[PDB]
């Protein structure tokens, strides 16, 4: 996990794959392959809708 939020090798090349989008994000089957990120950003403050 490099400083640019991506899993890079010793050569610095980022491994790609399927991204997840939404709230909550799920892996979609019809996306472009994207460099997989591990963001340290804050989560979505979601209130209670269905209980």
């Amino acid at each position: 996990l490099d400083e640019n939020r991506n899993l890079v090798n010793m050569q610095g090349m980022q491994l790609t794959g399927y991204p997840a989008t939404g709230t909550p994000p799920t892996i979609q089957q019809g996306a472009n392959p994207a460099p997989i990120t591990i963001p340290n950003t804050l989560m979505a403050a979601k209130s209670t809708t269905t209980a």
Partner: protein, 151 residues
Amino acid sequence: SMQINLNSTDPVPSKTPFSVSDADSYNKKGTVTVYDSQGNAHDMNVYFVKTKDNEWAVYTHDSSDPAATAPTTASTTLKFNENGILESGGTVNITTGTINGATAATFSLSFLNSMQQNTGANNIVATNQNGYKPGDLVSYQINNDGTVVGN
């Protein structure tokens, strides 16, 4: 051209009406990256909703242009027989959008030999377009026929 193998044992999507952000409103979403005379990569989301047995409303949505509204009309409707052979609804001309002052490009789209699986999972077989962007001479080779092939 877009060939796709589709499971027949799938039920009708219960989420009504259709939304492009509602994955449960359809069963399968495709995506094809095409290019225009300005060379913008228009990524068409191709949604497939099982209306009934062998009949699938097929929607097109230029996802690369954010000014496009939610498509509630059918681009086509793939209708098939009992055996699952490609019967009707597999060809439509689709107009793209305009990105950064481009032109809305209309292309012929064929779903030729898209087969209906008796069982399995909805899987796109292949996608192909004759549109691209340059592109320059990197290297060159010659095969065993004397043809100078450009790379």
